[PDB]
Amino acid sequence: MLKDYHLKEMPEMEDEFLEYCAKNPSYEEAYLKFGDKLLEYELLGKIKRINHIVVLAHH
């Protein structure tokens, strides 16, 4: 609609992470860029890691 500037709200972005995880190679970059987001989602069951890199776990 209107022209927005630099002003943006940052509540908690997480679907950004969840679609970035489709870049399975270098899962380490998707961890370290975000932070503890990859750790918790791995322990949860949105993603998993077991092989060498991350796999998606759409349940």
Q: Which long-range contacts (CB under 8 A, 24 or more apart) does 28-31 make?
A: 30/54
Domain count, the chain: 1
Question: Phi, psi at residue 7, to the nearest 5°?
Answer: -70, 125
Cβ-Cβ contacts under 8 Å for 18 (sequence gap 6 or more): 41, 46
Classified as helix, coil or strand, 37 is helix
Domain that holds residue 39: 1-59
Q: Which two tokens stand for residue 12?
A: 């908690």
The experimental method is NMR
Q: Cα–Cα distances in Å, from 7 out to 10, 15, 33, 42?
A: 10, 20, 22, 32
Q: Give the distance, in angstroms, between the CA of residue 20 and the centroid of all CA atoms in the same chain.
A: 6
